[PDB]
Design a protein around this ligand. Sequence first.
Ligand SMILES: CC(C)(C)N1CCO[C@H](COc2ccc(NC(=O)NC3CCCCC3)cc2)C1
Ligand SMILES: CC(C)(C)N1CCO[C@H](COc2ccc(NC(=O)NC3CCCCC3)cc2)C1
Ligand SMILES: [Mg+2]
Ligand SMILES: [Mg+2]
Lengths: 319, 319
Amino acid sequence: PTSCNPSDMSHGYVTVKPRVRLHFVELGSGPAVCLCHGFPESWYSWRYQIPALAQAGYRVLAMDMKGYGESSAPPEIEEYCMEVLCKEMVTFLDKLGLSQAVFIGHDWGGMLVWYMALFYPERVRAVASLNTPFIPANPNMSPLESIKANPVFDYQLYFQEPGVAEAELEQNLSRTFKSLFRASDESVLSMHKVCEAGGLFVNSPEEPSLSRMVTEEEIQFYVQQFKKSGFRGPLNWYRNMERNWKWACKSLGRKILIPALMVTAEKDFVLVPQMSQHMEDWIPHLKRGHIEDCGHWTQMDKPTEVNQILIKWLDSDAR
Amino acid sequence: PTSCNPSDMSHGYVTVKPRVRLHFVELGSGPAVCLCHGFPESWYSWRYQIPALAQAGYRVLAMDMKGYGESSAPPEIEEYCMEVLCKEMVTFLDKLGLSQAVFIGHDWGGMLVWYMALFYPERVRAVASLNTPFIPANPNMSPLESIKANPVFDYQLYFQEPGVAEAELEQNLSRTFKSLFRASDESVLSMHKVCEAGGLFVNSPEEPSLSRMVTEEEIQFYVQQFKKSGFRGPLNWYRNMERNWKWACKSLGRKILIPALMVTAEKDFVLVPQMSQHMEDWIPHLKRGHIEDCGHWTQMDKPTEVNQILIKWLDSDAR
Ligand SMILES: CC(C)(C)N1CCO[C@H](COc2ccc(NC(=O)NC3CCCCC3)cc2)C1
Ligand SMILES: CC(C)(C)N1CCO[C@H](COc2ccc(NC(=O)NC3CCCCC3)cc2)C1
Ligand SMILES: [Mg+2]
Ligand SMILES: [Mg+2]
């Protein structure tokens, strides 16, 4: 599938708060489709989708989320709570003069677009998430224990204390992204042993091989992007669990009434498909997609399957 | 009519040549409408149109033309010939992934969009010009004498030699724009006596009053923009008459077959309406608008009339 060369895109910049501007890349004409990447990624994680969606008749806006790339990265941890991130994305639409947009997200971006669907349905034409389920907030369970209930989320505790994960992730950025951006059968890390081993990579190769999913050039683009602001901003998306919990609780009782799509990846061992199994009860018009042989990095593991799923859904439920 | 605050726009940047990027502001959703300002102006000359068109259902892209504002201003005079300017605007569309756009232009921007219609009709959904007629190139008359045939174009000779006009226009930028941006009944200069008086302003007030059309704040925005790159780039649009002549001649014999709109201003004493009187013969589907009591600065003299004319035409002949 056709990918993207970064210097041949149109780059757009929108100021949403005094010291916060969002960067995005824009390709195509038609209904506005806003792509929202996950951790720790980039607008460029959508490189295989951007030209495909544009060619299918859509105006694509691929975000550098707050903390990433060319977008502003405010220093405060609480600027990356889900509530401020959504309200900024509404201002984004406001300043662009868009009444609504289709929202498609992956990982933390997928969490974001569900909350945009839940609290700002008037502004979301339709919503799709890759891997990330929508699970109503449990007003009786704190976020801390719901992590301790599943050892797979052990790495999110390691991510909590500022500066600890930043040092590991920034010590060798090429090692970082070659160790992360891998297919499930190629993985070189266990999210289980992280807080017991003292880090994500301490048992991983120092000179990791290059995944079949990516080139050295594509790795070096991510590396370039993260020299700009580092990992604090991105990691901060994990450091608002209790804030995000309380805000999510303020919604309870309402369904998402807009067209929706949940895409599951069969070998995402963290965002496993079954975590999504009763979303229909909260999202009446939910349609599904599922990708076999697909790990966590959905857009680059299986670009063609993603493109097909998205375009079929956009043409039937977004126009 | 609703105007624009510059810090609350979405700003877009597209690289079209190695050292040339075009800046534009983008508001709204719908068919792409590209606004192209004249001399010596800015995307901000369209401030009264941008929100009105967006509200009517159009995606507005208001350009900072090459040499202006936040767009690149290459040093070479021949980079501002009409041929390079159009081909760059095609690349603009290419890099944005737009198959076509409606093009609307004023003064030199209006000249540009006619040539985009003439040589790139496949890329122009529809075309409109304010004040600037389309007059087929006369392959038997050089541009120099066709100026000497009408003393009104005397100032274009004064504009020819690099550095001469730049010094006058840059010596007091507030004086420059308050002396230029005026209604016809308020004008303080004669384009007739310029090469005989030795300049545009030498007989004009040193502290000119402020036109009823503009505020001090709006003057200061233009002033800010022109501190960036000065007047050489903009003036260079006038310094390619023979190049533009030869290229225009290479078209002769073809009509503009796409939907078109010519808007005349009754008190534009340079781009007078009669200069447009036989465009129908070269442009079969041409529709007209005409604004009484309107000087050269069409968008800010008579914003409401402009908006009405444009939106009615866009809705009937552009969709
Ligand atoms: C119960 C649930 C689901 C709500 N939990 C527990 C409590 O809080 C978190 C908050 O929600 C999210 C949402 C997305 C992610 N994505 C992620 O971690 N991607 C990793 C990138 C690096 C390699 C491994 C994968 C993480 C957390 C989730
Ligand atoms: C015959 C014709 C029409 C082709 N001529 C003669 C030969 O070449 C020029 C080239 O075409 C253009 C096109 C637009 C402009 N606009 C302009 O001058 N605006 C001024 C701003 C400052 C105050 C006064 C008005 C000028 C020249 C025109
Ligand atoms: Mg159920
Ligand atoms: Mg005739």
